[PDB]
Design a binder for this molecule. Structure first.
Ligand SMILES: O=C1CCC(=O)N(O)C/C=C\CCNC(=O)CCC(=O)N(O)CCCCCNC(=O)CCC(=O)N(O)CCCCCN1
Ligand SMILES: [Fe+3]
Length: 276
């Protein structure tokens, strides 16, 4: 029995996708949690998946694999491999098992779930989650905007090693919830320089120019942000002086999947409400 394999923008099939795969290898942390949400049995997952404190609990049995670990992936005997479209070795992966390749941003973070529901005939489960999400986020939006005001601007940022990044509405780090689910505006330069591009690496000195009312900042640990937070440049930013900086744990906040997002939603709601 094969998947109906619908034509979906950004989804490429290699081989005959099983309708009911029993041994799924996920090589893209974007998708792992969607597969889990739809009760797919994962036997391989990524390093990020293992470090995500929400998701990791659900995939303890899975082996940590990278896309280059062809031998380990083969040994796992998958009947389905799920990958991002930018992976360079799709040919060799497809020799191991059927592959679903997904190109980020062709479908939104919600569509991806209903898309997998169609691929695997789990539409009911997908629809129910999406319904509750849309109802909950609509209510939560009203609550948070009652504190911030409706026109408050948010910037999504992330700290990685010595680097500083801004993110748009659809590159994780809380952007889906802040920009899409809560319909928060962003500063002008964020909308014109970051949103379409997905992300932007930036030098410290111009950071003030991209921050308005609030900032959500992702990092994997406390030490990464240390120097920045103590800098005069940083302390000069109005949002910082007003205590409108929401620091979040990247280990879960990198992610976009339903399981991660459930946790991120409560965290962001609570953080914004307590900013008052
Ligand atoms: O899908 C998302 C949000 C968007 C995202 O980050 N992606 O990687 C998916 C879309 C791009 C796939 C193509 N891969 C790359 O461009 C490699 C670099 C990359 O992953 N990026 O996100 C580019 C900007 C961040 C670079 C610094 N690295 C990290 O922050 C590690 C977390 C990091 O960026 N990762 O991707 C690892 C955890 C990802 C969890 C799921 N999150
Ligand atoms: Fe990434």
């Amino acid at each position: 029995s094969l998947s109906p394999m619908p034509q979906i923008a950004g989804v490429t099939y290699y081989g005959d996708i099983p309708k009911q795969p029993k041994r799924v290898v996920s090589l893209a942390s974007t998708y792992t949690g969607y597969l889990k949400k739809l009760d797919m049995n994962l036997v391989g997952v990524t390093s990020y998946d293992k470090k995500n404190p929400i998701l990791a609990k659900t995939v303890k049995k899975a082996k940590q694999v990278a896309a280059t670990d062809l031998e380990a992936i083969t040994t796992l005997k998958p009947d389905l491999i799920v990958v991002g479209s930018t992976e360079e070795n799709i040919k060799q992966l497809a020799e191991i098992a059927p592959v679903i390749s997904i190109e980020a941003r062709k479908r939104d973070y919600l569509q991806v779930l209903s898309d997998f529901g169609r691929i695997f005939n789990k539409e009911g489960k997908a629809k129910k989650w999406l319904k509750d999400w849309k109802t909950k986020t609509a209510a939560y939006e009203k609550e948070v905007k009652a504190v911030t005001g409706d026109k408050a601007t948010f910037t999504i940022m992330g700290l990685y090693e010595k680097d500083v990044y801004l993110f748009g509405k659809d590159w994780g780090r809380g952007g889906e919830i802040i920009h899409q689910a809560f319909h928060y505006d962003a500063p002008e330069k964020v909308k014109t320089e970051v949103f379409k591009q997905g992300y932007l690496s930036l030098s410290q000195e111009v950071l003030p120019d991209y921050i308005g009312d609030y900032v959500v900042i992702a990092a994997e640990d406390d030490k990464t942000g240390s120097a920045l937070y103590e800098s005069k440049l940083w302390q000069s930013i109005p949002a910082v002086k007003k205590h409108h900086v929401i620091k979040v744990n990247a280990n879960v906040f990198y992610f976009t999947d339903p399981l991660s997002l459930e946790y991120q939603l409560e965290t962001l709601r609570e953080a914004i409400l307590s900013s008052e």
